[PDB]
């Protein structure tokens, strides 16, 4: 039962009212979480509305962090956009 969002739509969620990003083709709503994120707000704000896979993977987030991330998944990138965005 995967819920899809287009890249066009995701790009709209780029601000303090609603911040989404993409990690490995999934869509995360970090609007609230970014106020708590141990890595700070601005790394996430810079990524809002787009893919942040590379950045996320480079840090070496802990297994508890990676598990926490799953709680913010709201859907996945629409199939029509999956050539634009690397998994
Ligand atoms: C939903 C996704 C995310 C969650 C739940 C999350 C969670 C956390 C947590 C709990 C830590 C503390 C260390 C650890 O446990 O690994 C952390 C640190 C960090 N995160 Fe994230 N993170 C997320 C996304 C990101 C993204 C997308 C970026 C980059 C654009 C990022 C950059 C950082 C950095 C730079 C730090 C290390 C801060 C330091 O101690 O210097 N995080 N994150
Ligand atoms: Ca805070
Ligand atoms: Ca703030």
Swiss-Prot record:
The chain holds residues 8 to 94 of 134 of the full protein. It comes from Sus scrofa. The lineage of its organism: Eukaryota, Metazoa, Chordata, Craniata, Vertebrata. GO terms for cellular component: endoplasmic reticulum membrane; intracellular membrane-bounded organelle. Residues 2-78 form the Cytochrome b5 heme-binding domain. The modification N6-acetyllysine is found at residues 3, 12. This is Cytochrome b5. Belongs to the cytochrome b5 family. Heme binds at residues 37, 61. The keyword Iron applies. Cytochrome b5 is a membrane-bound hemoprotein functioning as an electron carrier for several membrane-bound oxygenases. GO terms for molecular function: heme binding; metal ion binding. Keywords: Acetylation, Cytoplasm, Electron transport, Endoplasmic reticulum, Heme, Iron, Membrane, Metal-binding, Microsome, Transmembrane, Transmembrane helix, Transport. It comes from the Eukaryota.
């Amino acid at each position: 039962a995967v819920k899809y969002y287009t890249l066009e739509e995701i790009q709209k969620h780029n601000n303090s009212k609603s911040t989404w990003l993409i990690l490995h083709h999934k869509v995360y709503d970090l609007t609230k979480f970014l106020e708590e994120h141990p890595g700070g707000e601005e790394v996430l704000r810079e990524q809002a509305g787009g893919d942040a896979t590379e950045n996320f993977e480079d840090v070496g987030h802990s297994t508890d962090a990676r598990e926490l991330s799953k709680t913010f998944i709201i859907g996945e990138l629409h199939p029509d956009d999956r050539s634009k965005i690397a998994k």
